[PDB]
Design an enzyme around this catalytic site. Structure first.
Site, PDB file in Angstrom:
ATOM      1  N   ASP A  35       0.767  -1.240   0.000  1.00  0.00           N
ATOM      2  CA  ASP A  35       0.000   0.000   0.000  1.00  0.00           C
ATOM      3  C   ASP A  35       0.804   1.300   0.000  1.00  0.00           C
ATOM      4  O   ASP A  35       1.375   1.689   1.026  1.00  0.00           O
ATOM      5  CB  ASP A  35      -0.921  -0.055   1.226  1.00  0.00           C
ATOM      6  N   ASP A 218      -2.251   5.686  -5.259  1.00  0.00           N
ATOM      7  CA  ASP A 218      -2.572   4.785  -4.156  1.00  0.00           C
ATOM      8  C   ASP A 218      -2.872   3.357  -4.597  1.00  0.00           C
ATOM      9  O   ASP A 218      -3.948   3.076  -5.121  1.00  0.00           O
ATOM     10  CB  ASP A 218      -3.771   5.346  -3.384  1.00  0.00           C
TER      11      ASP A 218
END
Length: 325
Positions: A35, A218
């Protein structure tokens, strides 16, 4: 696989991808979500009392290199998911790269969304300024200081489910078989701890659906989340209708749709027609783009599975190019 290469596994319909990481001595393998939207490395542990029975749990007792830490942690993500626990120290093997004494965060409690998820935790690749505990050095920080990588970069390839899925992260280098043409260098704004870039404009056909706007790369997010006005402008171009929950209903037949093109630092990057559909449930299709109450966009997977990105934490900057296919 080469040194620093971590094969990824595509979960569901490009919902999220995860790579295996070995933690502890002799060590266990954990499927972690990579992430770039966060910077904490946390995993389910045998100290957790509401974790999924299917998750692999880290056991301090089974690692000879485990070192206790008196600090606690608590994290709350945008999607409302959460977790908390205690800190610890142990060795982490990332694609053959052995990070010694990495600060890891063991979960004692986690939201139901994680307990039911396919991964055992998260590997944060955002910047050090947003680690939940002050003073914690991120995995990238340690790869650099311990000389495990010669260049502060990682190449990211996320495959499309319709192409067998898959994916691959390479720490310390990148793979040019995964993209076509030349890489475009794009400056990064890390003032908020994220990989922020500026998109000059977005067009669909001959229509400019949006002028310049800011966003963040992201990998932890599936959809392309745009500010209200921009999302509405984009939805109108595809004739999609607002579902009221931040998502849009779009025609399952993308054969007639034109690609959503992003102009970034002078070059063109797109979200192919097939990527405009995120999920199809009982004949209904949810669009690959949605909206939120932010002044900036959240450029998630939908975009990344169409463009290869080389993250350079050192400058910082990113290099992008259309994926090869």
């Amino acid at each position: 696989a080469g040194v620093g290469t971590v094969p990824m596994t595509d979960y569901g319909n490009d919902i999220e991808y995860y790579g295996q990481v070995t933690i502890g001595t002799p060590g266990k393998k954990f499927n972690l979500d990579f992430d770039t939207g966060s910077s904490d490395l946390w995993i389910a542990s045998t100290l957790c009392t509401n974790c999924g029975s299917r998750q692999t749990k880290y056991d301090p007792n089974q690692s000879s290199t485990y070192q206790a830490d008196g600090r606690t942690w608590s994290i709350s993500y945008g999607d409302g998911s959460s977790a908390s626990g205690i800190l610890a120290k142990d060795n982490v093997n990332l694609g053959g790269l052995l990070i010694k004494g990495q600060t890891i965060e063991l979960a004692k409690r986690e939201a139901a969304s994680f307990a039911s998820g396919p991964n055992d935790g998260l590997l944060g690749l955002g910047f050090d300024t947003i680690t939940t505990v002050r003073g914690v050095k991120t995995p990238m920080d340690n790869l650099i200081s311990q000389g495990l990588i010669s260049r502060p970069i990682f190449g990211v390839y996320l495959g499309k489910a319709k192409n067998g899925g898959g994916g691959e992260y390479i720490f310390g280098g990148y793979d040019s078989t995964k993209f076509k043409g030349s890489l475009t260098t794009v400056p990064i704004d890390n003032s908020r701890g994220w990989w922020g870039i500026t998109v000059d404009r977005a067009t669909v056909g001959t229509s400019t659906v949006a002028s310049s706007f800011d966003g963040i790369l992201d990998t932890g997010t599936t959809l392309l989340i745009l500010p209200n006005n921009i999302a509405a402008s984009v939805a109108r171009a595809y004739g999609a209708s607002d579902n009221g929950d931040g998502t849009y209903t779009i025609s399952c037949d993308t054969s007639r749709f034109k690609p959503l093109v992003f102009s970034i630092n002078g070059a063109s990057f797109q979200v192919s027609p097939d990527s405009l559909v995120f999920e199809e449930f009982q004949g209904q299709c949810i669009a690959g783009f949605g909206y939120g109450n932010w002044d900036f966009a959240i450029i998630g997977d939908t975009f990344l599975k169409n463009n290869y990105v080389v993250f350079n934490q050192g400058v910082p900057e990113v290099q992008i190019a259309p994926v090869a296919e």
